[PDB]
Design an enzyme around this catalytic site. Structure first.
Site, mmCIF file in Angstrom:
data_model
loop_
_atom_site.group_PDB
_atom_site.id
_atom_site.type_symbol
_atom_site.label_atom_id
_atom_site.label_comp_id
_atom_site.label_asym_id
_atom_site.label_seq_id
_atom_site.Cartn_x
_atom_site.Cartn_y
_atom_site.Cartn_z
ATOM 1 N N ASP A 42 -24.074 -12.011 12.408
ATOM 2 C CA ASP A 42 -22.892 -11.191 12.193
ATOM 3 C C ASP A 42 -22.969 -10.387 10.904
ATOM 4 O O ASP A 42 -22.581 -9.216 10.873
ATOM 5 C CB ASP A 42 -21.630 -12.060 12.180
ATOM 6 C CG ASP A 42 -21.316 -12.660 13.545
ATOM 7 O OD1 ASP A 42 -21.911 -12.222 14.552
ATOM 8 O OD2 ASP A 42 -20.452 -13.557 13.619
ATOM 9 N N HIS A 68 -28.104 -7.282 17.267
ATOM 10 C CA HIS A 68 -27.006 -8.234 17.172
ATOM 11 C C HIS A 68 -26.984 -9.210 18.348
ATOM 12 O O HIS A 68 -26.983 -10.426 18.160
ATOM 13 C CB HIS A 68 -25.712 -7.427 17.075
ATOM 14 C CG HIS A 68 -24.456 -8.231 17.042
ATOM 15 N ND1 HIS A 68 -23.288 -7.790 17.625
ATOM 16 C CD2 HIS A 68 -24.157 -9.415 16.451
ATOM 17 C CE1 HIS A 68 -22.331 -8.676 17.421
ATOM 18 N NE2 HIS A 68 -22.833 -9.669 16.708
ATOM 19 N N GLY A 126 -19.746 -4.715 21.075
ATOM 20 C CA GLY A 126 -18.533 -5.376 21.511
ATOM 21 C C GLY A 126 -18.672 -6.173 22.790
ATOM 22 O O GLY A 126 -19.539 -7.039 22.917
#
Ligand SMILES: O=C(O)/C=C/c1ccc(O)c(O)c1
Lengths: 121, 121
Positions: A89, A47, A29
């Protein structure tokens, strides 16, 4: 952008993306990277390392096209930067789902400033 | 630090601090400030403007002493900066509790990168 990323995570995991992964561990996040806490965290590690090469677009704000076809994230045709972004993603969404088995809620709202510095990507 | 701040919020509200206020609106929790979305959010707006007046301590990681006396947050002496910091956190905790009545869950996991830029403090 965060909209597409959140929909991907929801489609794959079946969980509220923001609630489960918006502040998970040292990597998921908001903000940057830290030493991963577990497999779920490491997903977000890879990521954000994946994001690093995307200096030509905005991983947080730039929208892109993708579809949910036969329960598979299929990245639509875009420009190179947006296409790679979509793949970044997609990969983290799959990875988050694959690792639900060791998801630990004590990491859900992890206090990230106290995370140890991450290795270079 | 985040530990004392989260505890103050819990003591006043008394809700899970990280869960309710870790990512609320454009101002609560991580990152900087944005144009406030409601009264709760504005609490954190003032909160972060308060931090800007500190003179050398770390709002996120510096521990400080305070006590919960007769259901009142009482900041310990500490040093001048830590005391100011403690008063900043006490102020936001009280304010968050004061505005529970208009707490909106839709803002709980707000996508902050799409917030409008805040006024200078
Ligand atoms: O995580 C959830 O699914 C909801 C949690 C929750 C717990 C208490 C509340 O008051 C609230 O609005 C939401």
């Amino acid at each position: 952008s965060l909209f597409e990323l959140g929909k991907m995570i929801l489609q794959e995991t079946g969980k509220n993306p923001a609630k489960s992964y918006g502040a998970y561990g040292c990597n998921c996040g908001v903000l940057g990277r830290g030493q991963p806490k577990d497999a779920t965290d490491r997903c977000c590690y890879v990521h954000k390392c994946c994001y690093k090469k995307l200096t030509g677009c905005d991983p947080k704000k730039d929208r892109y096209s993708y579809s949910w076809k036969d329960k598979t994230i299929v990245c639509g045709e875009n420009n190179p930067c947006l296409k790679e972004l979509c793949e970044c993603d997609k990969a983290v969404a799959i990875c988050l789902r694959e690792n639900l088995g060791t998801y630990n809620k004590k990491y859900r709202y992890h206090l990230k400033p106290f995370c140890k510095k991450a290795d270079p990507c």
